[PDB]
């Protein structure tokens, strides 16, 4: 029915209505880091 990763998380499935095999990549996520000069210098910032 379904595939699992090395850590036993779900990784792929058959579609219940068609025997084609589809993978499940996690949706994109990550930290937001604010690169800033000191607020004594400027109120400009850049975001990583």
């Amino acid at each position: 029915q379904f595939g699992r990763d090395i850590a036993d998380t779900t990784d792929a499935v058959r579609d219940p209505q068609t025997l084609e095999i589809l993978d499940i990549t996690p949706c994109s996520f990550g930290g937001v880091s604010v690169i800033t000069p000191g607020t004594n210098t400027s109120n400009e910032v850049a975001v990583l």
Binding site: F2, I6, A12
Partner: protein
């Protein structure tokens, strides 16, 4: 009569695909090198 099973009698234990991995599972299996009554 009797015979050695060797390493036989493994089967896919669940409806799950896995690849490039070593997975440890507890189930009914033919224990390795077990005596297997032989008939004809």
């Amino acid at each position: 009569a009797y015979t050695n099973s060797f390493t036989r009698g493994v089967y896919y234990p669940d409806k799950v695909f896995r690849s490039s991995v070593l997975h440890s599972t507890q189930d009914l299996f033919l224990p390795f090198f077990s005596n297997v009554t032989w008939f004809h």
